[PDB]
Amino acid sequence: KSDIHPEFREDAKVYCNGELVMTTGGTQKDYTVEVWSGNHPFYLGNRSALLLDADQVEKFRKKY
Amino acid sequence: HTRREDRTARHVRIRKKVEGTPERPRLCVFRSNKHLYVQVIDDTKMHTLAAASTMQKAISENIDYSAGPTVEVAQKIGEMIAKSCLEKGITKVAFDRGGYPYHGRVKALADAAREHGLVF
Amino acid sequence: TKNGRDSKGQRLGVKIYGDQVAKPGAIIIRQRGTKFHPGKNVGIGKDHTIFALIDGLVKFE
Amino acid sequence: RLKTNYIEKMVPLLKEEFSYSNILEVPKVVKIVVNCGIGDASQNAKGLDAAINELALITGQRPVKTKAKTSIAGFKVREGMTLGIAVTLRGNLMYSFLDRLINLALPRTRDFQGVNPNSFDGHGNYSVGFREQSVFPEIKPEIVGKARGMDVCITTTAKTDKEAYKLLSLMGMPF
Amino acid sequence: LSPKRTRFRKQHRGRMKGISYRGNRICFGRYALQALEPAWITSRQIEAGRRAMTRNARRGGKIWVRIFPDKPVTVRPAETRMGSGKGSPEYWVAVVKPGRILYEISGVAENIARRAVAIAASKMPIRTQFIISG
Amino acid sequence: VKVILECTGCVRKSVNKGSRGVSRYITQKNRHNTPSRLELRKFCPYCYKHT
RNA sequence: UUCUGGUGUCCUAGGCGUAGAGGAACCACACCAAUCCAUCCCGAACUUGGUGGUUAAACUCUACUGCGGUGACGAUACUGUAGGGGAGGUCCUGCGGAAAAAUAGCUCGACGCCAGG
RNA sequence: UGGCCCUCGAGUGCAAAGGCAGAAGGGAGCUUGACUGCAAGACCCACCCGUCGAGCAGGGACGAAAGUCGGCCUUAGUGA
């Protein structure tokens, strides 16, 4: 229908802070995007947190 | 739920209101994706009077590569169903839509049936 | 001290039975709702009563 | 553009993974549907306008304020009241917003659970639901101080034990 | 004893008929008390016969009360007789026709069930007998 | 309240074939004024029968 | 002259389910776009115009009594008349009619019109 | 809000009964037949009453037409 629907643009520029640009179709023309799923720390964030931070004995030996 | 049961349910919905009489037969259509069908039938004796189809006009003007039902072959088969029952004694007829809503090629099919002076 | 005696007196029913000669306009069935649906050569009424349109017998199927 | 990535690579390995015999028996995603569960939108008139403008910029098209199916006592619900504002988008918008669930919901969730093998498991026709990301990053987020409801139901054609989970697994939904 | 919910408060009477061909058989239990005589049996005689044969078994076995009243009897007061105003919370009544099993019992030997079923048949306005599970 | 009230046409006291005022019984008007198109007046086509 | 598929009508109503088959033709889904048209949003539905592949879904045909529907005979309750018993509740006879439920079975419909090949 | 199952158990301004599943139940468009003059024949029938009605003319409403509409699914809501 006309006159009610928002402008669904085909040229939507997805800009990453790591100098990567991909094309998607959406509302805005430009999208400044953070941690988006390709090269996201979901393989290393669960490696750094809940998997390696727990220590009580090797913390004790570093002060003696 | 499905599309075919929706068409058949719409056609049974139409069939309650319109009935074939021995004075006025009823002509029903079937717009299959390859062919149209049109049936001048008489319900009180349970037999057809004047049937035509895309397999009747398709001797001269048809393209099977295209989508078979077009508005132009609806104009042509309304033309031949308008001049096929006129030579039989069928002037005053009771048209129903065949379970399909009226805004389509059944516009020019019904008006094409009106073109040869049928009392619609 | 009773809360009763509230009769109604209203009557209905089958007026013309099967295999009987009807008249044009003869009320065949007076009914509440539709126990008897209108077939052919009959008509349904304003309060769902069934009258005959033409002469002849009446049937049930 | 992920429908072209949907055509040639992730359909035939579902064709040979289940060991079919014909092409069209392989299932596909049919439609997704978003609703905004709101109990107070006749009073909050600018929250319903926030659903129209803001939620119409969340999804592809304008959403529909939903009239009440019934009236339950206790709540402020009458026959025909706005109980949530929903939208049903379909087509290439469907691929574009499951795409926006790959891009805007999978890496930007504070939780790291993703698709769940212990949720949306058993259905007659398999449906996947999420309660996440009340505002997309296209909308300036700090205006709406209310965590409004938002559910995105994906639909499929399959009636099996494997195929929808592998369908979201082949798309951008790790866990 | 008494039904909890009543679909209708007061319900008029109904006359006895021939041999009940349905409730004549024995479903549970080995022994039974078949009635030869069509009348009413209130819940009061059912409490009397139930206490009679439960305390006449008194060591083992279980009885089976078959019938439930399901209809009231409205007794008008002594208020010079014209109306059926209120008699519904008064005594309930079970219709029994001939053939019908009233009581059953199991886990009991021969003559202990003969005295158990036969003594508890004296708490009852209609002549009966005891029947073995044939 | 359910006030009974009459609809009326346009009067036209004339010497035509029985030309005279036509009022019709109607009900329910506890609202804005509703002129309905009751017709077959003394002049045979008619519309906007007022009050 | 069978199949195919629009159409009905009588119907014991013919359905669920398990199995096998059909894409020459026909019917049906699927992909592309939207000009009339359209969905309180979505070409999901409806419409128009085409690529035109499959039987996957849906239709059609053939089997099964596992459910479902239907359903006996004989009996028996009841009942019309003519009577009899009981204190009552109520029962029994002569003749006539005759159940219901259950069971043995029956049923995966039957007849016509018109257009192909 | 999405999907399967049972398929009429929901609903119909209100009491119950009889009805009604591609509906008489819910929605949307246009609407004013909630007209005029009537009316063959029936039911109910102490009388008074009361109920249904094919069909005709005028002038229309909807629909593309076929047709339908003389208030409401019906029975109560009244007074010579």
Burial classification of residue C38, based on how many CB atoms lie within 10 Å of its CB (0-12 exposed, 13-18 middle, 19 or more buried) = middle
What's the start-to-end Cα distance of chain B, in Å? 33
Q: How far apart are CA D168 and CA D115, in angstroms?
A: 8
Burial classification of residue F8, based on how many CB atoms lie within 10 Å of its CB (0-12 exposed, 13-18 middle, 19 or more buried) = middle
Calculate the angstrom distance between C1' of G100 and CA of E100.
20
| DSSP secondary structure letters along D73-130 | TTSS--TT----EEEEE-SHHHHHHHHHHHHHTSSS-SS---S-TTSS---SS--B--
Long-range contacts of E54-61 (CB under 8 A, 24+ apart): E56/E115, E56/E116, E56/E119, E56/E120, E57/E105, E57/E107, E57/E108, E57/E112, E57/E113, E57/E116, E60/E107, E60/E108, E61/E105, E61/E106, E61/E107, E61/E108, E61/E113
- Is the alpha carbon torsion for D9, D11, D15, D17 positive or negative? positive
Instruction: Please name the helix (run of DSSP H) or strand (run of DSSP E) that holds residue E48, with its range, or none.
Output: helix E43-57
Q: How far apart are CA C2 and CA D145, in angstroms?
A: 65
With contact defined as beta carbons under 8 Å apart, do E23 and E114 qualify?
Answer: no
Residues in Cβ contact with B97 at an 8 Å cutoff, skipping those fewer than 6 apart: B14, B29, B106
Q: Do chains A and D touch (3 or more CB pairs under 8 A)?
A: yes
With contact defined as beta carbons under 8 Å apart, do D51 and D36 qualify?
Answer: yes
Q: Quick one: resolution in A?
A: 3.3
With contact defined as beta carbons under 8 Å apart, do E97 and E76 qualify?
Answer: no
User: CB of residue E37 closer than 7 A to nucleic acid strand G?
Assistant: yes
Domain ranges in chain E are: 21-134
Method: cryo-EM
CATH class of the B17-120 domain in this structure: alpha beta
Q: If we measure between CA atoms, which residue out of E73, E74, E133, E76 comes closest to residue E108?
A: E133
Calculate the angstrom distance between C1' of H28 and CA of D69.
18
With contact defined as beta carbons under 8 Å apart, do D31 and D90 qualify?
Answer: yes
Q: If we measure between CA atoms, which residue out of D103, D110, D95, D122 comes closest to residue D173?
A: D103
Of A6, A14, A42, the CB nearest to D107: A42
Q: How far apart are CA B75 and CA F5, in angstroms?
A: 55
Could you tell me the CA-to-CA distances from D60 to B73, B89, D87, E78 in Å, in that order?
Answer: 39, 58, 9, 82
Tell me which chain E residues have a C-beta less than 8 angstroms from the C-beta of C2: 83, 85
Q: How far apart are CA D151 and CA D132, in angstroms?
A: 7
> CB distance D108–A35 less than 8 Å?
yes
Pairing of strands D64-65, D85-89: antiparallel
Q: How far apart are CA A5 and CA D123, in angstroms?
A: 34
Pairing of strands E101-106, E62-65: antiparallel
Pairing of strands B94-95, B26-31: parallel
Q: How far apart are CA E130 and CA E104, in angstroms?
A: 9
Domains and CATH numbers, chain F: 1-51 (2.20.28.120)
Q: How far apart are CA C31 and CA B111, in angstroms?
A: 44
Tell me which chain E residues have a C-beta less than 8 angstroms from the C-beta of C1: 83, 85
> CB distance A40–D107 less than 8 Å?
yes
| DSSP secondary structure letters along E77-89 | -SSSS----S-TT
Calculate the angstrom distance between C1' of G62 and CA of B53.
31
In this complex, how many residue pairs, one in chain A and one in chain D, have their CB atoms less than 8 Å apart? 47
Q: How far apart are CA A34 and CA A20, in angstroms?
A: 11
Pairing of strands A30-33, A9-16: parallel
Q: Token pair for residue B46?
A: 């349970």
How many C-beta atoms surround the C-beta of residue E83 within 10 A? 11
User: CB of residue B9 closer than 7 A to nucleic acid strand G?
Assistant: no
Tell me which chain C residues have a C-beta less than 8 angstroms from the C-beta of E83: 1-2
Coil, strand, or helix at residue E109?
coil
Calculate the angstrom distance between C1' of G68 and CA of D139.
58
Could you tell me the CA-to-CA distances from B59 to B13, B73, D82, E20 in Å, in that order?
Answer: 34, 12, 59, 80
* AA letter at D170: L
Q: If we measure between CA atoms, which residue out of D93, D78, D103 comes closest to residue D171?
A: D103
Quick check: A43 contacting D, CB < 8 Å? no
> CB distance A37–D172 less than 8 Å?
yes
Domain ranges in chain B are: 17-120
Residues in Cβ contact with B43 at an 8 Å cutoff, skipping those fewer than 6 apart: B19, B20, B21, B26
With contact defined as beta carbons under 8 Å apart, do B56 and B77 qualify?
Answer: yes
Q: How far apart are CA D121 and CA D109, in angstroms?
A: 21
The number of helices, as runs of H, and strands, as runs of E, in chain D is: 5, 4
Q: How far apart are CA D88 and CA D97, in angstroms?
A: 11
Minimum Cα–Cα distance from E84: chain C residue: C2
Minimum Cα–Cα distance from E82: chain C residue: C2
With contact defined as beta carbons under 8 Å apart, do E133 and E30 qualify?
Answer: yes
Calculate the angstrom distance between C1' of G30 and CA of E12.
69
CATH topology of domain D1-175: 50s Ribosomal Protein L5; Chain: A, (3.30.1440)
- Chain C window 2-21: which residues touch E at a Cβ cutoff of 8 Å? 2
Phi, psi of E82 (to 5 degrees): -135, -30
Quick check: E83 contacting C, CB < 8 Å? yes
User: CB of residue B101 closer than 7 A to nucleic acid strand G?
Assistant: yes
Phi, psi of D86 (to 5 degrees): -120, 165
Nucleotide nearest to F41 (CA to C1'): H36
Of A4, A28, A37, the CB nearest to D102: A37
Phi, psi of B54 (to 5 degrees): -65, -25
For C27, what's the count of Cα atoms within 13 Å in the CB-facing half-sphere?
12
Tell me which chain C residues have a C-beta less than 8 angstroms from the C-beta of E85: 1-2
Q: Which residues of D114-144 are buried (b: 16+ CB within 10 A; e: fewer)?
A: ebeeeebeeeeebebebebbebbebbeeeee
Of D92, D93, D174, the CB nearest to A42: D174
* AA letter at E77: P
Quick check: A20 contacting D, CB < 8 Å? no
Coil, strand, or helix at residue E131?
strand
Quick check: A2 contacting D, CB < 8 Å? no
Q: How far apart are CA A58 and CA A64, in angstroms?
A: 10
Pairing of strands C42-44, D32-36: unpaired
Could you tell me the CA-to-CA distances from F25 to C9, F19, F28, F38 in Å, in that order?
Answer: 33, 19, 11, 11
* AA letter at E84: S
How many C-beta atoms surround the C-beta of residue D94 within 10 A? 20
- Strand H bases near protein CB (under 7 Å) are 1-5, 17-20, 22-24, 31-36, 40-45, 51-54, 58-60, 64-67, 71-75
E touches which chains (3+ CB pairs under 8 A)? C
Strand partners, E128: E35
Strand partners, A21: A15
Tell me which chain A residues have a C-beta less than 8 angstroms from the C-beta of D97: none
With contact defined as beta carbons under 8 Å apart, do E72 and E88 qualify?
Answer: yes
Burial classification of residue B119, based on how many CB atoms lie within 10 Å of its CB (0-12 exposed, 13-18 middle, 19 or more buried) = exposed
Quick check: E77 contacting C, CB < 8 Å? no
Nucleotide nearest to F39 (CA to C1'): H35
CATH number of E21-134: 3.90.1170.10
The number of helices, as runs of H, and strands, as runs of E, in chain C is: 0, 4
